[model samples]
Target chain A: MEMGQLKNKIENKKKELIQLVARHGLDHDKVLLFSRDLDKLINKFMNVKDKVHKLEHHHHHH
Target chain B: MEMGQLKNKIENKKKELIQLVARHGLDHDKVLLFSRDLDKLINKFMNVKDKVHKLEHHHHHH
Candidate 1:
């Protein structure tokens, strides 16, 4: 996130998010609801998500 | 929930979910986290969510 080699590492993809909050920060009440609803959205999207992933290992990410 | 005239409500462009656990019924950790995560997702989507409103009204559904 430090702008140094930022684009490089993003393209490199060294680390991955455990949950979005890791990068985003902790949560408040309103923030919590959006996060839950989005989970439902993604569950629905699994059947609908396009070719969005690449040479990635989501194996343990869930 | 009784499913009588269900479409008569929630114009599908509704807003704001309060203590969802109250209706769904729970501060039991994981559910709590998911509820929180969803809150953030919608906030981001507000800038991106399409023109999906026809609304009779949100009323006190908040």
Candidate 2:
């Protein structure tokens, strides 16, 4: 996904996680699994951002 | 790692990520990579918690 779309997905997932925590508490397996899903999305976002940064750096240096 | 120790590791990594973000700003590759590292730790924690939950369920059902 593009960076902006990925970021939007992360924000929605973040809200979902907050709601899940409110319902299930932080320590519950269900909450933790949802939290894991959020992390995965955020991880993908970071990876994309990292590549973008690298490409920008390469462009500037060349 | 055991749950408690893993939790502690996650906590510490969380702190480190915060500091990195503060220093480098969130868009920097350094900060994003650190965030990725945190996600890996959290992912492992969730996986361990999942297995523990499954084990408990099995024990109770059998």
Candidate 3:
């Protein structure tokens, strides 16, 4: 699948998770934990995404 | 390399961060600030990921 496909899946999952939290009345700390987990995941993905893009650009030049 | 790998990495990082926060005994306001910053970053990534998925889906349909 393409990057976009992965992105969309993540987005939908995020929304669903947020809604689930809201519905379940999660505590502040629990919500914070979830958000932090998501932040780390996204940052990691962004790093990899950038690396892949750079490789693609270099490949195009060669 | 896989989604599971990324998810596991995130889970580990989150546990480490929570432990650090607990050991440091950060003030409520500081913790809130970090959480907010994290939320913003994650939300931004979710948006981009969704767009990428949509594009990929379109390509596949064509």
lDDT of 2 by residue, B30-53 (tens): 555655554544444455434344
Report the number of the highest-lDDT candidate: 2
Error of 2 at A9 (Å): 30
Question: Which parts of model 2 have CA positions greater than 4 angstroms off?
Answer: A1-62, B27-37, B44-46, B49-62
**Native contacts kept (model 3):** 0.02
lDDT of 1 by residue, B9-28 (tens): 21111221223322232335
What DockQ score does model 1 reach against the true complex? Answer: 0.06
Give all TM-scores, in the order shown.
Answer: 0.25, 0.26, 0.29
How well does model 3 score by local distance difference test?
A: 0.47
Sort order, TM-score high to low: 3, 2, 1
Chain A vs. true chain A, TM-score per model, equals: 0.31, 0.36, 0.43
TM-score, cand. 3 vs. native: 0.29
Off by over 4 Å in 1: A1-55, A58-62, B1-18, B48-62
